[PDB]
Amino acid sequence: SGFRKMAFPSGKVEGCMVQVTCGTTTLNGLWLDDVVYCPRAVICTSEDMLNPNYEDLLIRKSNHNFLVQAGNVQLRVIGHSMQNCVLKLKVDTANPKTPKYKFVRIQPGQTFSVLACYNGSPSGVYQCAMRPNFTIKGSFLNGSCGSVGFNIDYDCVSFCYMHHMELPTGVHAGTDLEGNFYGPFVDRQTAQAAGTDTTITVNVLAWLYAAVINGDRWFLNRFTTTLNDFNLVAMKYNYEPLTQDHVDILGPLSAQTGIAVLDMCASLKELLQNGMNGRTILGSALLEDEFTPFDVVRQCSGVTFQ
Amino acid sequence: SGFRKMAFPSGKVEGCMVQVTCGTTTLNGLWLDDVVYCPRAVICTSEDMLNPNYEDLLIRKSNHNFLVQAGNVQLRVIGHSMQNCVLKLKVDTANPKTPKYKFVRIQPGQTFSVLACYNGSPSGVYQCAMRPNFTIKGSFLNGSCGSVGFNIDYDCVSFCYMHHMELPTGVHAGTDLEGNFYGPFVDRQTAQAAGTDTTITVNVLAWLYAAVINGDRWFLNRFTTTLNDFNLVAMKYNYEPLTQDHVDILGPLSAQTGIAVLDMCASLKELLQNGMNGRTILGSALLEDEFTPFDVVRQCSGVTFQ
């Protein structure tokens, strides 16, 4: 029983975090095999970050302009290249702690664990969702650039995020491990801001199922709705439209609880129209949207507290 | 910016988790140096758990009745003894991944990270607080017994919790690493239940400071209160009394934000009397009490967004 915002165990990623310094700029890198991946902004002075030409800045650098430290050992950079917004620093030592890994780009509405790191030293781990507007509501301070987000499946680490910057609203923006930004953001100093966001409806429904699995049903009702009728209410409350694929994804949770997906939609519609009336669901007074159907299935018992 | 329920990086603990089997019962153990620590309930059949005499059950066991597996390697048990509610299985191999560690018992109101584990394999990591009633609101399924809770300070792992059982309300109970239960609970099948709980007032105040540090002040007011006048309101809302030591602990947060502790108490008093009026604080619609002053200082910038 219980339901928590649960991250994946971070050890496999901890063994990959290093410190990268170029000039007076220091940030985190990811050491996999004989390559260290880090944000290309490491080559910029704060003067440069306003209007940087990264190709022009990088051609003026040599391998020995890059200082990479893994704990107490200094790794020798033997090559360097830029791929989109990341630098790839080839080093003379392959990381003996390299896990099985993939570079995967995630979809808005999906979740991942973040290992917050400073000066190559891991500080904390937490769960995040990619927002519909391609920002993440992370927790990051100066020095966290290059921290990574990931999921783990059968000892294989799927890296999906590298942290780059904080936006004026305090939310965060970054790239996949190929250096391609999530959303309309750039690694330069501009007035860029997060666009309008929405609530991840399929995740809210999954979380309502999580509450039922743990033995709570107070928000349920005898009503049902059509997919079209629910989406008309969802649009009014800034919720994303629900698709038939979303209904199919919620199938296993619907079967375990005996509550049809469109029946749970009727419950959500009532919760949106009436609020919670002083009550809580899984310890929250808001409708939580940062748990995917997979997250619920992974954490909740396979047997419902009937 | 941002504020998340952030756990410590779990790698140092992952390298210590093993599987312990005795008869048909399997759970998790903690392998430090040449000793494996696990709940003594591993020696019980489910028949035994109603009224077990553990000394009588243990004397009937030999070293070879205990099967310990660390990944794929089986460790040979060369000794065994019981200390309170934990078993200590001496093995013939010292764990080469043993971190610097301590066995510390925590106080109600303090926080720790939990590495949820099943069959000796870590599954997830999350933050928990020890409740005033000595339960934890964890997330645990069958097979999680022996999972541990910990804090990390300068590469030293302070182990503070080993998981034992789930109570009828879905909350969790366990011991320190010396096998002594937190709270009035026992490792046998009884009608035991969680006692009445309260809200951790000092943590709520710390969390309000965290909100101010990140740039939010909507809940503040021009009023102040005396420590006695606040505690009269705290008692009515099932909040713990605030001590002068608590005020002293909040000193650094009060100085960083320029908000006197008794001024923040006035804000909390108003929030308790009037609710939030549809507004949120740090993404929550409830007053959060599972962040300590230390947790806030560790995660928040040292500079307040003025």
Author numbering:
A (entry chain A), B (entry chain A): 1 to 306
Excerpt from the publication:
The complex structure is similar to that of the mutant alone with an rmsd of 0.259 Å for all Cα atoms. The substrate binding pocket in the complex structure is slightly expanded compared with that in the apo mutant structure.
Mpro is a cysteine protease that cleaves at no less than 11 sites on the replicase polyproteins. Initially, Mpro releases itself from the polyproteins through autocleavage. Then the mature Mpro forms a functional homodimer and transcleaves pp1a and pp1ab. Given its essential role in the viral life cycle and the absence of closely related homologs in the human genome, Mpro is considered an attractive target for anti-CoV drug development (12–14).
